[PDB]
Symmetry: D2
Subunit: 285 residues, 4 copies
C-alpha cells in the first residue's frame, strides 16, 4: 500500500477545416483513491468549453466547437495524488461467481466494439484454460501478448480490434489493451479499458492498458511492458476505446502537435512490475 504524487500535462493543437465539434478526454479522473490537488485547462484562442460525464462517471469529457480555417490549442496541467494496494493473489483459484458480482461489474463481461470476446472463447480456453489461478491466467494472457504481438508504430488504426490483432500480431498500446480485455472476457473474467498518463513512458504519450476484476478487486495489467505499473495516473476506464478516445472529432480537423508528460513528485520512486514467479496484483483503490 503506497501513495504517490505526480505532475501531469498534455497539450494538443488542431487545424480546423470546416465547422467542427470536439469531445476530449484528457482530465485526470477524481476517484476515492485518486485526488487532484490542483488543475488548469486553457484553450487558445479562448473558446467556450463544457465538461460533462456519462451516467457511469468514469471519465471527464470536455467539449467545444470551432469554426473553419482556424487553429487552436488546449493545455491541461494538474497535480495528482494516487494510491494503490498490492494484493496477494495466492488464493485466487476461482473467479468471483457471476451471481455474486456487483451489478456494475457485469457489463465488463460482455463483448464491445474493439473486444469481440464472443469470437475468441475457444481460442482463449485452448491457450489459457488450464491455468488454475485466476491472476496467473490473466498474467499468462498478458505475457502471451507481450511475446507474440510486435509493438509497431503505425501498423494499426482506430478501426483495428482485438479480433484483428490476434492474427495480425502487430499493434500499439490501444491494440494491446483491447486484446488483453477480449481474452479476459472470453474466459468469463470481467475486464475494462484503462487510459492514463504514464511516468517513465518513453517517448511520453497517453497510455492505454486494462484492468481485470480478480477476487473483488480491479487489478491493473499492461501487455506492452512499456511502463511501471505504479507510475500510472488514471484518465478513464470504460468498455474499450469507444468510451475513452483522446479526441472525438465531428467535422474536419487534424492535430498538428501534441505533448504529454507525467513527472513524479516523490523523491525516491521505485518501479513495480509483474513477474510469473510472484502472485501479487496491483490495484488502484
Amino acid at each position: 500500500s503506497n501513495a504517490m504524487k505526480f505532475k501531469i500535462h498534455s497539450d494538443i493543437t488542431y487545424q480546423v477545416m470546416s465547422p467542427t465539434t470536439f469531445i476530449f478526454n484528457v482530465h485526470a479522473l477524481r476517484t476515492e483513491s485518486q485526488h487532484i490537488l490542483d488543475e488548469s485547462l486553457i484553450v487558445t484562442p479562448p473558446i467556450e468549453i463544457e465538461e460533462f460525464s456519462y451516467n457511469s462517471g468514469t471519465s471527464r469529457f470536455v467539449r467545444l466547437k470551432a469554426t473553419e480555417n482556424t487553429t487552436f490549442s488546449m493545455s491541461y496541467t494538474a497535480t495528482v495524488d494516487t494510491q494503490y494496494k498490492v494484493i496477494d493473489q495466492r488464493q485466487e483459484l476461482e473467479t468471483v461467481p457471476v451471481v455474486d458480482l456487483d451489478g456494475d461489474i457485469i457489463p465488463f463481461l460482455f463483448p464491445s466494439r474493439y473486444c469481440q470476446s464472443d469470437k475468441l472463447q475457444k481460442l482463449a480456453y485452448k491457450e489459457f484454460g488450464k491455468i488454475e489461478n485466476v491472476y496467473s491466467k490473466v498474467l499468462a494472457i498478458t505475457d502471451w501478448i507481450y511475446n507474440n504481438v510486435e509493438y509497431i508504430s503505425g501498423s494499426t488504426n482506430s478501426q483495428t480490434s482485438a479480433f484483428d490483432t490476434i492474427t495480425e500480431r502487430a499493434g500499439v498500446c490501444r491494440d494491446f489493451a483491447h486484446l488483453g480485455i477480449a481474452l479476459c472476457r472470453a474466459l468469463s473474467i470481467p475486464a475494462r479499458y484503462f487510459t492514463g498518463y504514464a511516468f517513465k513512458l518513453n517517448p511520453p504519450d497517453f497510455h492505454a492498458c486494462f484492468e481485470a476484476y480478480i477476487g473483488g478487486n480491479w487489478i491493473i495489467f499492461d501487455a506492452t511492458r512499456l511502463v511501471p505499473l505504479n507510475g500510472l495516473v488514471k484518465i478513464a476506464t470504460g468498455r474499450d476505446a469507444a468510451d475513452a478516445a483522446v479526441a472525438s472529432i465531428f467535422g474536419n480537423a487534424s492535430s498538428t502537435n501534441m505533448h504529454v508528460e507525467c513527472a513524479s513528485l516523490d523523491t525516491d520512486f521505485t518501479p513495480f512490475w509483474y513477474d510469473k514467479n510472484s502472485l501479487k496484483g496491483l490495484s488502484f483503490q
Copy 2:
C-alpha cells in the same frame, strides 16, 4: 410543435425451457421496463422447479436483469406474465432539417453516437454517406435507411447467429430482427445520428417472439423504427434499450445450457386497437414517452 398522445393497455407473457449440462449461471432479460410512460400494473416471475433468483440493473437503468444459477444435468422452466400500460406520442417531423448539435446533446445521448460490438459504424461511413447522405430531412433520412434495409435485406430465420453484426449483414443481405436493428443503428451512427437498440413484446407479431428494433434521436426525441416492417409500431411493450444486443440479450449463459422451448405472446386489451405504420409521405415519428 404538433403531436398526438395515446395510452395503451397490454397483456404480455414469456416462457423458456433449458437443459443444463454443466454448472451454469444465467442472466435473463424478460421483464417489462418501468419508465415514466410505461407502467406495470402487475407481474409474476415463476421458475419451476423453484431456483433462487435475483433481479438487478446496470447504472444506466434501461433494462431489468434477473440472474440464477443451475447445477449440471438440470432441466428448468421460467415463466413471466404481466399486464402493462404504455403511452406514446406521434410527433411532427416536417421541420427536422438538422440533427441536434453535438455540443447541445445531453451527456447520456452521446454514447449512442459511437460504434458498438454489433454496430461498427466507424466502418460504414463512406457507404452510409453515398446511399443516404444527400437526404435533407433527418427523419426522412432515417426512414430511408429503414426502407433500404427492408427492401435489400431478406428476412430469413436461422441465417445468422449471436456473432453476426451490422458489418456482416451489409454483405450477407439476410437476417432476423436483431440484425435488422443492428444495421439500422450502425447506418444512423455512421451519419452522426444517435441511435440505440430497443427490445420488447410485440402485438400482432407472427410467429410470436421477442422483437428488436431501434430508436433514433431526432429533434430531442427518441423515434422508433423497425426495418422488418413486421409489427405495428404502437403495439410494442419495451423490455430494454442499449447500445446493441450486448446490452439487451434475452439470456446470457455462463456455462453449458441450451433452450428447448420458447413461447412469447402479447395481446391488446383496448376497446379499439388501430395499427400505426409509417408512410414515406407522412413526416410523423412515433415516440415512446
Copy 3:
C-alpha cells in the same frame, strides 16, 4: 533413399442422393484419380434414374469431374464403385533443407506458394513466423504445423461451412477435415513452403466419409500430412489435388438442391495391411508416387 510400398489394393464406394428444388447443374468430384502410381483396375458409375453425364478435367488434370443437369422438383441418386491400387514411397528427410529453393522449383509447383480462396497465407505471415519460424528443417517445420493444428484446433462436426477458411479456423479453433487441411496449407505457404489440398477415400476412417488433407513439397517430393490424425496415411485413395477446396469440391451446385443420403466407404483388399503414422521423432515422409 526411399522405401517403396507394394501395390496397395482397395475397394472404394460412394453414393449420394439429392432433392432438386429448381433447375440445377451439378459438377461432382467422386472418381479415383489415374496417376503413374494409382491405377483403377475397375470402376462403375450409376445414376438413378439415368441422367446424361459427362466427365471432364481442367488443363492441370489433377481431378476427374463429372457433370449433369437435373430438373426442378425431382430427386436422383448417384453411385460410384471402384477397385484401385496405390503405391507410395517413404522418403527419409534427415537431410532436410533449411528452406525451399524457390528459384529452382518446377514452374508447375510455383502456384502452390500463393494464397487461394480458403488459404489466406498472405494474412498469416507474421503469425506463422512467430509460431514456427525457429524450426530449422522444412520437414520438421511442416510436421510442427501439423502437430500444432491437431493440438490446438478441435475436431467438431457441423461447426463450419463451405465459406470457412484458414483465416477463420486460426481463431475459431474448430472444424472438420476440410478446415484442418486448409489451415495446414495456409501456414505452409505463409512460410514459403509450397502446399496443396488433397481429397480422397480413406481406409479405417470412422465414421466413413470423404477425407481431406494436404501435401507439402519438400525436397522435390509432395509429402502428405493430416492434422486430424484420423486415418493411416497409407490408407488413402486419391480423388483430387488442387490449391484448396475451390478446386476439389465433392459437389458444386449451380441452382437449388440439397443432399438427402450419403455413404462413403474404403476397404483394403490386402492380406496384411499395416498402418503408417508419423512420429515427431522419425524424419520420414510418405509420398504418393
Copy 4:
C-alpha cells in the same frame, strides 16, 4: 468488326536487396493468337542469371532471378507489340452459356479465389443485378455500379485487400476494382478472370488491372475504373485474380526504389474507345 494496332511498351524497376532474395516478375507481354511481339528486350544491371517460365495454363510469362544480400539491381523490359480486338454484338446474349456446355478450361473461372470471394456475395449480387436480362448488360451494370459507388483513391488499400473488403470500404485502386467486378460476375454464375497489362493513355503511366467476362463464347474486356481506353491495353497476364499475376513476388527482403512504366501508341490515328450503356457491343482480345 476487327481492328489492330501497334504499341511500344516499357518497364523498369530498381531494387535494394537486404538479405538473399528470390524474385518472380511478370512484366513481359503475352504471346497469343491475337497479340504479337515484333521485338523485345530484357536487360538486368548488373547482369544476374534470369530464367523465363510459365505455369501449365500458359497465360503469363514470368521471369525469376536470385539476388545476394546488400546489393542493388535494375531490370528493364522493352518491346514492340501488335494487338488485335474484335467488336462483338451482344444484343442476343440473353442467357449465360449453360454450365454443362462450358469447356473444361472455362469452368475454373466460375469459382471463388483469394481476392474474389464470390461465394460470400451471391445474395447481394442477385439483389443488385439479378433482374437484368442481357448477360452483357448485367456485367456492364456491375462495372457501372463499381465506377459510381467505389472511389478511386491511391494508397487506400494494400495487397491483402479483397473484393469482400471493397464492397463495404467503397475505395480502392485498379486491382480492387478488377477483383470486385470478377467476384460479382462469378456470384451471378458468369465466368470472369483478372487481366493485367500495359495501358495507353493511363495518367500517370503504370501497369493496369481490369477483368474479362466470358459471355456467349467470348472473353469480353471490362474496366470499372474507366481510366483507360479499352483498345489501349497490351496484355501481360490473365488468371483467377492477382495471386496469379503479381508484378513482383519477393521471397526474402528487398524494396523497390522506383518503378517506371510506359505505353506509347505507334499509330498516329489511335481512336480511344469506351462502352456506352445502351449499345450492346463488347470488345474482345482474340
